Amino acid sequence: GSHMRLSRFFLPILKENPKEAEIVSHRLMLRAGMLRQEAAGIYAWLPLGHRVLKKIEQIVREEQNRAGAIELLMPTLQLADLWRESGRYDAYGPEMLRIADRHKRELLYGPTNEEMITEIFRAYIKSYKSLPLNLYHIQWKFRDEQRPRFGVMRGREFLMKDAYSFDVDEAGARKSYNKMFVAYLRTFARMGLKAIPMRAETGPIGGDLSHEFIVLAETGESGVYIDRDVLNLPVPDENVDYDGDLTPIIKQWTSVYAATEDVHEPARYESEVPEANRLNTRGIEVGQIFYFGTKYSDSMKANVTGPDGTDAPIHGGSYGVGVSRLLGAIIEACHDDNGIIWPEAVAPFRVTILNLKQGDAATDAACDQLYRELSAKGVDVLYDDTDQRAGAKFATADLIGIPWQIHVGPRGLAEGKVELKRRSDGARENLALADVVAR
Amino acid sequence: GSHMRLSRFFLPILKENPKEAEIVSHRLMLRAGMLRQEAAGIYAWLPLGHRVLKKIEQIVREEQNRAGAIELLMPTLQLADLWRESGRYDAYGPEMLRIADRHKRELLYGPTNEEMITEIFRAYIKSYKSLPLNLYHIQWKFRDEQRPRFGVMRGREFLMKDAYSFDVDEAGARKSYNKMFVAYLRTFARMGLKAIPMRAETGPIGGDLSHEFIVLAETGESGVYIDRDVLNLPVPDENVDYDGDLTPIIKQWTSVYAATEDVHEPARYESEVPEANRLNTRGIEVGQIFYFGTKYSDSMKANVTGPDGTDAPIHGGSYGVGVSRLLGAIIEACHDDNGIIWPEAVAPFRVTILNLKQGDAATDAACDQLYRELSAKGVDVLYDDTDQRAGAKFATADLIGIPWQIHVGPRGLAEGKVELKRRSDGARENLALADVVARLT
Numbered sequence A: 001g002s003h004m005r006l007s008r009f010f011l012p013i014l015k016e017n018p019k020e021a022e023i024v025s026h027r028l029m030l031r032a033g034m035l036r037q038e039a040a041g042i043y044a045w046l047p048l049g050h051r052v053l054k055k056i057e058q059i060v061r062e063e064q065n066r067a068g069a070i071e072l073l074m075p076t077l078q079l080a081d082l083w084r085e086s087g088r089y090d091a092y093g094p095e096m097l098r099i100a101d102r103h104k105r106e107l108l109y110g111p112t113n114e115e116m117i118t119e120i121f122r123a124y125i126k127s128y129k130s131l132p133l134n135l136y137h138i139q140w141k142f143r144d145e146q147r148p149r150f151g152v153m154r155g156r157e158f159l160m161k162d163a164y165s166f167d168v169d170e171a172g173a174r175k176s177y178n179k180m181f182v183a184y185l186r187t188f189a190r191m192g193l194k195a196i197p198m199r200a201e202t203g204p205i206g207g208d209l210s211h212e213f214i215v216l217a218e219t220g221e222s223g224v225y226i227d228r229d230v231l232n233l234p235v236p237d238e239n240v241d242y243d244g245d246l247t248p249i250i251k252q253w254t255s256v257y258a259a260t261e262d263v264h265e266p267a268r269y270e271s272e273v274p275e276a277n278r279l280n281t282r283g284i285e286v287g288q289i290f291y292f293g294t295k296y297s298d299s300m301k302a303n304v305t306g307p308d309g310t311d312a313p314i315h316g317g318s319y320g321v322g323v324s325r326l327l328g329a330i331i332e333a334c335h336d337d338n339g340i341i342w343p344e345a346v347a348p349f350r351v352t353i354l355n356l357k358q359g360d361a362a363t364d365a366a367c368d369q370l371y372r373e374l375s376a377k378g379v380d381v382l383y384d385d386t387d388q389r390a391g392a393k394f395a396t397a398d399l400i401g402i403p404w405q406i407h408v409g410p411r412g413l414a415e416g417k418v419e420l421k422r423r424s425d426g427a428r429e430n431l432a433l434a435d436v437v438a439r
Numbered sequence B: 001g002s003h004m005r006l007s008r009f010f011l012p013i014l015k016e017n018p019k020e021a022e023i024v025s026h027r028l029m030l031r032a033g034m035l036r037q038e039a040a041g042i043y044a045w046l047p048l049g050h051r052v053l054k055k056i057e058q059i060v061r062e063e064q065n066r067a068g069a070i071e072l073l074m075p076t077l078q079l080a081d082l083w084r085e086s087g088r089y090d091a092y093g094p095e096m097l098r099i100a101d102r103h104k105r106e107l108l109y110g111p112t113n114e115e116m117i118t119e120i121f122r123a124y125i126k127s128y129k130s131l132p133l134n135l136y137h138i139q140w141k142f143r144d145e146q147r148p149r150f151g152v153m154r155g156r157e158f159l160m161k162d163a164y165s166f167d168v169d170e171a172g173a174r175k176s177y178n179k180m181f182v183a184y185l186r187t188f189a190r191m192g193l194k195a196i197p198m199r200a201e202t203g204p205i206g207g208d209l210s211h212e213f214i215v216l217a218e219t220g221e222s223g224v225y226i227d228r229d230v231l232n233l234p235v236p237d238e239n240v241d242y243d244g245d246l247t248p249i250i251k252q253w254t255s256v257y258a259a260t261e262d263v264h265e266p267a268r269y270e271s272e273v274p275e276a277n278r279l280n281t282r283g284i285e286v287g288q289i290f291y292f293g294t295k296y297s298d299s300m301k302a303n304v305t306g307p308d309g310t311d312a313p314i315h316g317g318s319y320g321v322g323v324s325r326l327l328g329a330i331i332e333a334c335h336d337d338n339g340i341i342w343p344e345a346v347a348p349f350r351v352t353i354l355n356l357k358q359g360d361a362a363t364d365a366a367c368d369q370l371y372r373e374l375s376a377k378g379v380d381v382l383y384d385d386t387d388q389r390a391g392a393k394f395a396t397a398d399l400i401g402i403p404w405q406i407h408v409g410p411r412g413l414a415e416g417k418v419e420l421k422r423r424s425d426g427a428r429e430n431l432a433l434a435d436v437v438a439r440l441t
């Protein structure tokens, strides 16, 4: 289990708030040594930030696999011609970064991957028997956003797990859509986020199949109207049967009202949601599921032979989690006046060890000992071993958001004890040096 | 320990050799449904392909960390203005993908990251007390290779681990370089490769101190000139002391003449080598290390305060490993007439269970249990539960090159036994359905 010492690390703390940051999470990612802007909307992820980014990446992956989706990797650069096949090339917009290689071939930095995935599908898959199929990757995208803004939350280069489903009819597709809906409730739950499924902007297709998963915040960009009972709903444990019928679970979440400003009916809101249960607020879109049937398979001629032996365009859906952007949501949703409060499951380190008289023989040895014992039992452990006063060490440990602190000085070591602090709520428990490892 | 059922999976095996694939590594990867060409030298990585690539990435990550380097991540898109600071803008020449954004801003797709990493460093580091510092990331890169070729070996969108050291003076840089040198020996060895550190030139990267780690091979774009002695030297174990004097190991590995063709000189060669060992020959370059002194720190004003209270530019070096290229190079060094033979460390799965009569409940259940137990016992396992017949399952499982096959069927199963094939060499073996798992764990 990974383990670092600050004096061997790279963690550039900024004492003061950077002018260029408006919302709290940007403001905090910069001070917490997690980020550097390289161009507008384009970020280097500094060591601490990358660790968090990796953890979010892993969780998202685990839930995709748990739901049966298969991981591959598509390239950043796509041919224009591919996009011409589907009629999105000129249609997508100026946010698509266009590139010309040395041979004047037209490529773009992919903002997304429907055409590409379809291309891949039609090259290999021929019979209804291979389906359902859910193919996904976690990969960098570009949208030449008009005003790159809010640090990681409206950037231009950004990390997204995008998933793509392939079914025989609308029936199978809605089944695949359920699978991802469930996978998503779990995903966000595992990140200490209550993200709410909300019916969101459908295309010319109509119907019900489109949901944005939204975390609530007054700082947020998307506006919402919700029946508060939805904040209390339970999130399927890890044993959910994904070959089964999730309609129950889906009904449990769609039954109660949930909508964004785009598809909101005042006349239906008033008809379903009791006066006191209503809440008009805003939120942060962290995930997005969208069923698009034969939109791509038509133009691209991605067909399979049905269970009656005739060729049909496949029905598909796509499912995106804003991986890089979660970093910004998680912090908005998890901070206080002292800085970040990482949920355990996404923190860059589980515990930091703080030396309150660094250089003194006895405490230095106790730190080493805990450093090494916590290391051996697969715990992510930073040991702040810098030549710096307790006060400085607290402000940083608190700033960077590590879930547990361990305070170690000659004081407590006198009666053979260390202070353990739980960041989220300030809980503290002066403890015996020999017990703390027992978590 | 990852587990998968080939019915659950996505693996598009090709029957014929692809006409486009000039060399084996390329041929095989397409055939073994690992890769797909999306553009000239730009590749999609299919599930199996991805999995290997992510194991390669991991072995490299581990060995970098063990050598004291610190992982971050820089973006794929860099500012041309940045490349103007150091000169390099007009000195990658045509292999640099230039991009204009919607606001007409000169961006490029980074082929490498010397200036950006320096940009970062100078922003935050001002004291010698902070060095040695080694920062690295594993990130996608683009070189507009004029004629993309040999699949993943000479493409355009490739994946590299590039790390960048920072020290007060040259002496420091040397220590830092030796660290990376030693980390490289382990990295490649851990992949079952014999990459030979040979002297090299630095080209656009810069510096007069450089080695390339080159894996010997016939179908390899690299002209090497090594004294064969060089070839069975000891690879330092997992417990090498990175803060201790690494000199002895570097010397061991550089006392013998070893040059790429760019630096090869023929006087020396003979008058330093046994004629019988002298072997001119081809190889693949899987990694390269350079010390470029104050190249970027000068032109970019990346200074630190030294011991004598004075300010002086830092001494840098960079270190790259062709992550995506390693797939290609591994196969070339590990194949036979029937397909890939994956070294254990980098295999997509450790063992595959081949079911030789799909639908018969007797073998099915016997397989399932074996599937489920090998999982729990922490091991990459693949179950071929397809509608396919033994012949086909043999050919496929041979192809994708899993180190171990498990042949389950009612012939051996009557005797409550199964066959175990080491893909490595074909060695076979019947043993009880029990004492099998324990022999892989």
Ligand SMILES: Nc1ncnc2c1ncn2[C@@H]1O[C@H](COS(=O)(=O)NC(=O)[C@@H]2CCCN2)[C@@H](O)[C@H]1O
Residues within 6 Å of the ligand: B111, B112, B113, B114, B143, B145, B152, B153, B154, B155, B156, B158, B159, B160, B161, B162, B163, B205, B285, B286, B287, B288, B289, B318, B319, B320, B321, B322, B323, B324, B325
């Ligand atoms: N087009 C390519 N396709 C696949 N792999 C490639 C490609 N170019 C470089 N490589 C791989 O990267 C390793 C190092 O490359 S290098 O020698 O040019 N070095 C550099 O670019 C320095 C070192 C890292 C960052 N800057 C090389 O050893 C090689 O394995």
